[PDB]
Design a protein around this ligand. Structure first.
Ligand code: SAH
Ligand code: SAH
Lengths: 285, 282
């Protein structure tokens, strides 16, 4: 039932600068968030391929990922427009009425006696009581007890990776800022790093011909208006050459494209669709 | 060399009504045009899923974007539906070339220049000079011209594709209902492969596409293909799958509750691309 692999996507913040209005800038950020949610992307890495655009993108991505009942707690907000344009509707974004094995919550600032556990706002009709003693303001994943007229529901804090790794549920993404293209690779949140890296380009090899190797943590990387060339050339930590040398695979995911250029946000949907069968097979236990 | 098959996409004009501003409405139309151009779609069918304004606005934006830039003044007077065209992303298709670019074919408009029966016509093909052709044609007609390898020959508009393998844009068709998508196909034998899309469809990974000549991929709007099927008095079906050769979910295990039509076109045409390419080949 569980999914043992992760999928990360990297792209440059600069793509917001190419948007033609403030409204379209915000919509574009939403397009990115939605593409990643649709394809059950676990991490979005926003890199500086050269600042403002990177930070604005990352913040919108985080806001959209956050369950609605937690947003006012984590975001000074009103971002509200971005959320209206492109809601994720992901499995952790359930309504108060819906039954769920897991829920995201925030530990509430309640005066408690040491050792007596904590109270969590999981967006339910009642607070959830947990045995772990945690600081108010932390975001946690709670597994609700199967057996529950008490003042609270009861649950236990579990790893935020449990819904995916144990139940096969998509549970949103984390957003990482990277100061350059080398940092996309170097500052992976996995000890082992990304063991399968895939770059994308019209100059890549045919995606249809590639055999994806078995993997645990995949990374798919996208460029902006000037391709992965911009990021590669700007970073002194990286080999000076065409970008294909920086990846395990470097693929064209739309053979015979009928437009001269495919935009980053279009390419993420096309590429993740093209790679989905392969990633599913190669990532399986 | 040539590509012997066509690919048509159908969707409801009603999706423009779900856009949250006038500017986003125009932007969304452009998203449809670009998704179709990227995938070398030859025809976009805009249908009325209620069984008029959204459909006409979508159709007009699609046609405007398809038209080579040097012919837009001739074919597109200023209109309210195109007031936000500046926010559109150009298609940058093969027939959208600059004046300096060498090309085997160019689109043109026959122009009013002195001629006599039998002495042919002149065509504005966007080149430095108007192009002389041997065929007598009325001014104002759009034609495909094969340049002599400033003289050319008017050829079938399907030659760039069928002979040279070039994507050459799309035609736009309005359909008054879902059944008309099928019934008013511009091909004599109709669409011989029809593919509907839905989260309730069978897994696209198991689909086996039969050899085909004219493929059709159909998308619903906010309420799915159920809406158009239900609203059309020419159909009396329980659910939409029986209208199609294949009825497919193209994004297994999707991580959002709903995939919007414009997202789904990109995902589904990507998912089907290997299959379509293989099954349509000579
Ligand atoms: N055919 C294709 N296959 C895979 N990815 C593509 C693609 N076309 C565009 N992309 C993705 O979309 C991004 C923006 S398009 C970049 C265009 C640039 N002229 C260049 O030389 O690459 C690219 O960096 C790549 O990540
Ligand atoms: N998983 C999926 N596979 C294929 N097409 C999909 C899809 N999800 C959405 N679509 C396409 O996008 C359109 C808009 S989404 C429609 C959702 C509607 N609640 C319904 O019951 O269908 C659909 O009509 C379909 O053409």
């Amino acid at each position: 039932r569980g999914r043992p692999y992760t999928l990360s996507v990297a792209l440059p913040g600069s793509i917001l600068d190419n948007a033609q209005s403030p409204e379209l800038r915000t919509y574009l950020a939403g397009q990115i968030a939605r593409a990643c949610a649709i394809f059950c992307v676990d991490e979005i890495v926003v890199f500086d391929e050269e600042g403002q655009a990177c930070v604005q993108l990352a913040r919108i991505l985080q806001y959209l990922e956050c369950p609605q009942y937690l947003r006012k707690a984590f975001f000074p907000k009103h971002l509200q427009f971005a959320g209206l344009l492109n809601p994720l509707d992901s499995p952790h974004h359930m309504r108060q009425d819906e039954e769920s094995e897991f829920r995201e919550g925030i530990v509430v600032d309640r005066p408690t006696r040491p050792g007596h556990g904590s109270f969590v706002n999981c967006g339910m009709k009642k607070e959830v009581k947990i045995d772990k003693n945690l600081e108010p303001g932390l975001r946690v994943t709670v597994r609700l007890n199967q057996q529950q007229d008490c003042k609270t529901y009861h649950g236990k804090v579990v790893s935020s990776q449990d819904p995916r790794t144990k139940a096969g549920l998509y549970w949103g993404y984390t957003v990482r800022l990277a100061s350059c293209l080398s940092a996309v690779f170097a500052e992976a949140p996995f000890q082992d790093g990304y063991d399968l890296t895939i770059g994308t380009s019209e100059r890549g090899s045919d995606v249809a011909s590639a055999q994806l190797p078995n993997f645990r943590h995949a990374l798919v990387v996208f460029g902006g208006l000037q391709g992965l060339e911009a990021g590669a050339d700007a970073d002194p930590n990286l080999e000076v050459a065409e970008p294909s040398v920086l990846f395990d695979l470097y693929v064209n995911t739309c053979p015979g494209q009928g437009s001269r250029t495919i935009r980053t946000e279009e390419a993420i949907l096309i590429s993740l669709a093209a790679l989905q069968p392969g990633l599913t097979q190669a990532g399986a236990r």
